Design a protein around this ligand. Structure first.
Ligand code: CA
Length: 251
């Protein structure tokens, strides 16, 4: 329809283990850790809150999902997903990578030829940051701003908005935490820094010591307002009932 958002990618893991038809395990290493479909020990809803959980301690993870390729030139790009560190994590990634066409999904590991890297990373109390990394001039450029990530056991929504006028916005739990211009907050005037020829693959390319992190409700769209709606329909419905079930079990 004329007022529909473009939904480039969406994944909520609502249909059992049919997700294995959409996500590709990388074969680069023989001993990657295994992702598992799980809702956890405590949850908002048993079926709705099923996501990909890291099932093994002290392992690299390499899983990716492809979608119909698109370019963000001339329009907004929004990347959204939920991260739940149910384990009370010591050290481990919770970020995504957005790759252009031509990625060997079976060869993905520590891949640097992505367009954008985004999301929480935790490694001891001294590392508790949200990455926002852009590929430009063959260099992966990190944000000059310090964004603090969530460190508890609960589900949190992470949102990156990239606009065609070289502006960005970061939200945690549907609330702005950081905002500005791409020329100012990175070490890159070029009107097309924001723009990439193809997005084709979203990758989970991580190391964790204490595993048990759940990933859910992935959204790549061109609509800010829809991401916010979807965030509330998704993370916003999870939050209260999850806290409630956890509070219960704590006795
Ligand atoms: Ca789900």
């Amino acid at each position: 329809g004329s007022m529909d958002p473009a939904i480039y990618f969406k994944e909520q893991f609502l249909d059992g283990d049919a997700w294995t038809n959409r996500w590709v395990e990388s074969k680069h290493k023989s001993d990657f850790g295994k992702f598992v479909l799980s809702s956890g020990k405590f949850y908002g809803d048993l079926e709705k809150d099923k996501g990909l959980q890291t099932s093994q301690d002290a392992r690299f993870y390499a899983l990716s999902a492809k979608f119909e390729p698109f370019s963000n030139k001339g329009q907004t790009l929004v990347v959204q997903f939920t991260v739940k560190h149910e384990q009370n994590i010591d050290c481990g990634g919770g970020y995504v990578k957005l790759f252009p066409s031509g990625l060997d999904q079976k060869d993905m590991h520590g891949d640097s030829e992505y367009n954008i890297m985004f999301g929480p990373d935790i490694c001891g109390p001294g590392t508790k940051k949200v990455h926002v990394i852009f590929n430009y001039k063959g260099k992966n450029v990190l944000i000059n701003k310090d964004i603090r990530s969530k460190d508890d056991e609960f589900t949190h929504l992470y949102t990156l908005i990239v606009r065609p006028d070289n502006t960005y916005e970061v939200k945690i739990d549907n609330s702005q935490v950081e905002s500005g211009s791409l020329e100012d907050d990175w070490d890159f005037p070029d009107a097309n820094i924001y723009a990439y020829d193809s997005f084709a693959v979203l990758g989970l390319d991580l190391w964790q010591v204490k595993s048990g992190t759940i990933f859910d409700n992935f959204l790549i769209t061109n609509d800010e307002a829809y991401a916010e709606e979807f965030g509330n329909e998704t993370w916003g419905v999870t939050k209260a009932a999850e806290k409630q079930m956890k509070d219960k079990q704590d006795e």
